[PDB]
Symmetry: D2
Subunit: 398 residues, 4 copies
């Protein structure tokens, strides 16, 4: 509960949660919502928690400090998972001044509908004295991931409250990074970036470059989700630079949907052709109807190339492929190559429309693979050869 000195974690662990953003981001290891109470000469509260825990939040905050003793409230991000307990709290201390970006005023009002609250706009470099020789330095970070996002730096203790950035949805009773299981931790960090931060990778390097340019010490990075980076904090920062640079491993992801397993047979063959041709490559196969969507996108993120599959259904693609291609267009993956494939009954046409959309999504397209009905021994030889040819074209230098 105690982060460092007079900084107190007053957040909420959520072991049961599985759905975020509707069902667009599934969290298989639950999550946590970090809120930090800093008490020097001035008592300042940094962010709240998910709206589902508003009652537990206020009550727990009472057991920590009398509400009237809170001087300032800092809101880095106005999304419901961080500002959901704000209305219930401001109902007890309505006159308390809030500090946020100009855009946050727009987003906070859009959620809580209380424009009378004492908002105080802050910009990059702005400071807020809190006594004892310590102050809060604000750093705007628009579109990382919302127009309203920012970060708060605490002088002296050298703590960077980054909110969503550098966070991960991984529920644990221990607070610090060196206290949890390392593999599960990093698997969750990468899952987060790939499914939410990918479309804004271009802003990451310049932003991180700017922050470092302030020559500020960082003993800890305290995110709004998961662990506090206490042990070797820049650790997670180095990763974000790596991830933001059109990241890719020697990996190929293959996903598809199928009605009678014909496209599946093509997928399996293509894989065998790849694994047989280039041993360095790690291959993954997924049925979009029977798989975790976020796991597919994480792999895609980690991949140098992708093969998407679909049969023709009513002159169009299959719904789950159409939807998954829509999401990829939004995530805008970069410097990746792709190939479409599928089976059909008579007129077909789904592989062609799938191929065009993959290209508009930003993928560098290779030749498509097409089969009629169920691939017989001859057709399967073609599918394996397609796997080999793809493996040669995409092969990394020796």
């Amino acid at each position: 509960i105690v982060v460092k000195n007079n900084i107190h974690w007053v957040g909420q662990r959520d072991w049961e949660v599985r759905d975020f953003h509707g069902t667009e981001y599934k969290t298989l290891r639950g999550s946590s919502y970090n809120s930090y109470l800093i008490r020097e000469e001035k008592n300042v509260l940094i962010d709240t928690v998910d709206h589902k825990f508003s009652r537990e939040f206020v009550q727990n905050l009472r057991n920590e400090i009398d509400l009237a003793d809170i001087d300032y409230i800092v809101i880095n991000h106005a999304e419901e998972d961080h500002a959901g307990a704000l209305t219930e709290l401001m109902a007890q201390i309505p006159d308390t001044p809030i500090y946020c970006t100009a855009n946050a005023i727009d987003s906070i009002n859009g959620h809580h509908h209380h424009p009378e609250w004492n908002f105080n706009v802050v910009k990059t470099g702005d400071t807020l004295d809190i006594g004892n020789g310590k102050q809060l330095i604000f750093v705007e970070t628009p579109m990382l991931h919302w127009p309203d996002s920012m970060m708060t730096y605490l002088t002296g203790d050298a703590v960077l409250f980054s909110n969503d950035a550098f966070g991960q949805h991984y529920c644990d009773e221990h607070l610090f990074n060196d206290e949890v299981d390392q593999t599960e931790l990093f698997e969750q960090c990468q899952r987060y970036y790939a499914n939410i931060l990918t479309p804004f990778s271009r802003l990451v390097t310049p932003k991180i470059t700017e922050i470092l340019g302030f020559n500020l010490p960082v003993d800890m990075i305290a995110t709004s989700h998961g662990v506090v980076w206490r042990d070797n904090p820049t650790q997670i920062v180095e990763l974000y630079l790596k991830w933001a640079a059109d990241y890719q491993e020697d990996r190929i992801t293959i996903f598809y949907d199928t009605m009678s397993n014909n496209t599946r047979m093509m997928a399996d063959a293509i894989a065998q052709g790849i694994a047989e041709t280039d041993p360095r490559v790690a291959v993954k196969i997924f049925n979009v109807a029977r798989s975790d969507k976020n796991e597919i996108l994480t792999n895609v993120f980690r991949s140098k190339g992708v093969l998407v599959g679909t049969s023709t259904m009513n002159n169009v693609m299959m719904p789950k492929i159409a939807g998954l291609v829509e999401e990829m267009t939004g995530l805008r993956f970069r410097n990746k190559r792709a190939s479409a494939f599928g089976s059909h009954g008579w007129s077909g046409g789904a592989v062609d429309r799938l191929s065009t959309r993959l290209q508009d999504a930003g993928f560098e397209m290779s030749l498509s693979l097409k089969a009629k009905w169920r691939p017989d021994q001859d057709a399967l030889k073609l599918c394996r050869e397609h796997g080999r040819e793809i493996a040669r074209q995409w092969a990394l230098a020796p």
Copy 2:
């Protein structure tokens, strides 16, 4: 097990099945696969069963008749749920002649890869004598629902083996229509047509008109799924004509997806505005992430108008909406009106792209509804008014 005289049901009931066409058609009441053995002077087998039951099928067929005694095999439709036990059967009696459409030869080979089988092409009006003054009259029905589809008429007994047409996925131990629960039966008939036959409605009336033009008596209609229409057979035929004529009731369906329930609030308000304005209208609301997709499409089929909802996510629609719009484009609903709506955070743009695609799908578009963040009391008044205005524009004549 006995249908009529020397016609024996030798199919397979499937109580456990939930998924068809991958997961594109969910069957909540299971299904059945009808195969009919006709024994006069010639023993003829009409269709087989799903590939998953190939072992049980052959064995049960042995207990009915020695395989060598089967003279002819009739294949109306070469989809795996009806011809899946064909390879395992033809391995015992390889020389047995098969009767089907020219397209069926292409589709059967595409599945079983046995081009050596003794195929015999049949066309509309063709006959196959089976002794005792009875014969089989074939009726081609391409694209109902496959290019290979046809129907078989048995003279004397006046039995029409229609295969998929007039069928429904409803598992019951009783075979005849008058023996099962009527409401569940018809609910399943309508669910079938809406999710599979809608795109081919234009072919239904001419086809049914043609068959009736043959002046043939019909004592029974024996489909490949579900009950045998024994009691008042034309019953289901009258329905298909009704359904094929751009069918619609005084009903409005509203579906959407949402990340923080903002679009949900708009949907609820719109509904209240409709119900309050026009009591004749039946309203339905669905969250595509939390609902049965086939149930949504059935309602859409039954509806005169639709309101589709979505928020903006990464400059695009939400995946499940994009996918569901893709499927509707394929099903090609006709003479229906629609309206797009949704919330957004800053730039938006998802409602506009949703509206265009709905139009390209064949919907007559009305004004869109847009809100920013969470709709406050003022915004909610607009959403209800949108419901009222829509209800007036779409209202049926007094």
Copy 3:
């Protein structure tokens, strides 16, 4: 929104909800939460809504009437789906007197932890004048379904606010029973009683007998879930008497779990043996792993007999069967007969323990059916014969 005269519906429709009591009661047609505002000389609020809609509730109540104008609050049932918006409301009007049973004081405090609230204990026959010649007559109904449950009768308008009783989870924009789809309505009424009220059937007839013994007119029955019974109200009352009397139709339900489909094959055979022997009987088969649990229990409720299936796994039953038998023990079905069956590999023992527990649950047991590994043609003949023998033993009089 207007029920009758000065009685105003101020509840909340819930189209999206699927889970109740964790996941023990799935609601496939959503639900609604009814709250009624009665305004004569005294303004009285009857129940609130689900805690998830506390914000929308208070706000909507403001748009209806100023909170200070509310004189009394009536709480028939203190479960979260009806009293979840009570804390948020009492925070605005803390001095407002509450009327409930003695047990409700215990249950309301156990949820809200505000023992200072002005509680007023009421008993059967107690009245509360509200002006204009009208008063509220209270009727305690403990264990229907909670120790705290009661009903409120409004004189003059003749409205019986029964809360949970006579309700159903069926979300619709129309409020009155004669305005909704009748089949869906009754299907939901029966689903409710079977899954929640079965264990307390013995209390239903005496309670309903008592209420009628008050010689009070009932123009409407306004439940807390779903429609208001406006058209022929006693309709639903007659049903409850029917349902409470160890209800059963000429129906047999068969459910089981299976690892390799051996027990499934036995189930299918048994069914064929039943349907072949006694045509009057309606048969239903369910795989507990692939089916809606509440649908299974509804059928069981409607059934005269049950056949539960399971294979032996690690010397014990299968989990989902063990769990489902645990729930049945709690629901305490009466005057029903049952038979256990299943397959095993070597030592077995699961059918025997399943049979004993079914008996302790209150089922009158018949002979068990046992098979080793996969039932061959001989074993299948035994399984069908078991179906026939069961069908004869349980047959209703001619």
Copy 4:
């Protein structure tokens, strides 16, 4: 495809599979089925594949070798996932002699119903010459995991075909252990043992001791699921000894079910009390209704102690807890301690029956924790204290 010298992998990768043993074992990374063709002077086939891939299996085996050239068939285990393609294969070469345990004859017949097949019973130490100075030495391993289980040792090449043992459900295009991701590999090995092999741990050490007592070299261990242990084979053997010895880490697992989140609140508090008292302990919390069951059991396996939770529902436990306790009784965990807890409304009684059953399952019981309705601040202090007290009682020596 080539394992070593004249040993050819001819199995089947299954990327899509999610369900095993009905739904009792969920496989989130798919699986594979290993079949090995050994060709010296005698051509011998070791096991087949899952029945779902019988067609692909035979066909692929044809492309490898003419069926008539197969001299012997070895069946280590007669479960459908390894002998499912046996009927379809024996239909082509009916006279081929089969080698298996006496119990396998019983289990193979129970599945395939072909008692005429040329079975040849083998016992531990039995040999089967295959030419070129190499022979097959058989090692019976009853109840690991079936009465029919055995292992086959190939002289010269020093390959131990262990079947299920040492296997894992982890689908990959690479065959050898040193070629796959190590963490995912071991996570799957442990998941397998915990969910299937736990009840037979007592037989593992004596069996492995016996095999090593034969003084046979092992260059490779070729299982029937997943990778071939090529690099440091004894690796997985050392683990099994570790796992079989009533394995436990410094870990505590907490699972429960809940209807209104009361028991959840108790669970969260207990955890906080543990983490606060003993930092060495890793804590895990699961909602049985919202979690992967196999993941829960894996943790339980890894745990020194467990806290199971449940509220009272209809005088009994909650179904999913009852079912999960039934399965644990079957898995028979050893040398673990446990504590029951839960909330109730009036009479309660579920915690007491849960506690007794946990004890009969083999857990050493601690004091139970009980609360009424929703735990207020006082009750929560008790729940945390319960966490502390448990943490002290179960603490490992300094």
